[PDB]
With several copies, the nearest count.
Chain A
Amino acid sequence: ALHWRAAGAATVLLVIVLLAGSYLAVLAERGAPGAQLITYPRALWWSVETATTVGYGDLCPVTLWGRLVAVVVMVAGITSFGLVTAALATWFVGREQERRGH
């Protein structure tokens, strides 16, 4: 079923984006005075922070490219999670039809 493949595909893709985002953030932030997003372990925690849109404020980019990377993370995360919500709807809508005969 498409909605399930998509969900899954969306999860593997998000994990890729997170990892690539941790890498790209450090590359972008290092070199900028006062920057804090400069070691991979925390950067990875930051990407998870961003994609889930929780945004604590303990870490965030300050360079143009860092922020640009941050926007791809947010958007991939929002889109990905929004797709799970959508696939859960197709499951419910499908099951609610069965329960009515159709």
Chain B
Amino acid sequence: DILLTQSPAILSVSPGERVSFSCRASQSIGTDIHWYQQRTNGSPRLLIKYASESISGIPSRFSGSGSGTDFTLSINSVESEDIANYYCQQSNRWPFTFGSGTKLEI
């Protein structure tokens, strides 16, 4: 069963700077990776699907890229509203699995 590694587990960046979240799969899964955002007390919210596809209602600020085993979630110009936990999820093989998560820090 596919293991999604998210490291570093915490990321500290300064206001307006560009940040990148890493997600590596234990085997090649194409572009079947999805990203979720979860603020303190809230439920997860889809950010990017299929590694790089935009979702409506999400700041154009958020983007994603990658394929195979290495995936990236980038936030161009961070800002306080982005402080949260970020998870990747794969749907290449059953069962779907989640990454351990990466905390963003300003």
Number of interface residues of A (CB under 8 A): 11
Interface presence of A67 (CB below 8 A) = no
Interface presence of A11 (CB below 8 A) = no
Which residues of A are found within 8 Å of B30, using beta-carbon distances? 34, 62
Decide if A32 touches B94 in the complex (CB within 8 Å).
Answer: yes
Q: Which of A35-43, A45-53, A75-83, A84-92 contacts B (4 or more CB under 8 A)?
A: A35-43
Query: In whole Å, how far is B26's beta carbon from the nearest beta carbon of chain A?
Result: 12
Which residues of A are found within 8 Å of B67, using beta-carbon distances? 33-34
Task: Give the nearest-CB partner of A36 in chain B.
Answer: B93
C-alpha gap A27/B31 in the complex (Å)? 19
Task: Give the nearest-CB partner of B2 in chain A.
Answer: A34
Interface presence of A30 (CB below 8 A) = yes
C-alpha gap A35/B91 in the complex (Å)? 10
Which residues of A are found within 8 Å of B95, using beta-carbon distances? 33
Binding site for A on B (CB under 8 A): 1, 30-31, 51-52, 65-68, 91-95
Decide if B91 touches A34 in the complex (CB within 8 Å).
Answer: no
Q: How many contacts A-B (CB < 8 Å)?
A: 32
Listed A/B pairs (6) with beta-carbon separation below 8 Å: A29-B94, A33-B31, A33-B66, A34-B30, A34-B67, A38-B91
C-alpha gap A30/B93 in the complex (Å)? 9
Which residues of B are found within 8 Å of A36, using beta-carbon distances? 92-94
Which residues of B are found within 8 Å of A35, using beta-carbon distances? 93-94
Decide if B92 touches A34 in the complex (CB within 8 Å).
Answer: no
Decide if A33 touches B91 in the complex (CB within 8 Å).
Answer: no
Decide if A31 touches B94 in the complex (CB within 8 Å).
Answer: yes
Decide if A33 touches B92 in the complex (CB within 8 Å).
Answer: no
Which residues of B are found within 8 Å of A33, using beta-carbon distances? 1, 31, 51-52, 65-67, 93-95
Decide if A39 touches B93 in the complex (CB within 8 Å).
Answer: no
Task: Give the nearest-CB partner of B71 in chain A.
Answer: A33
Which residues of B are found within 8 Å of A38, using beta-carbon distances? 91, 93-94
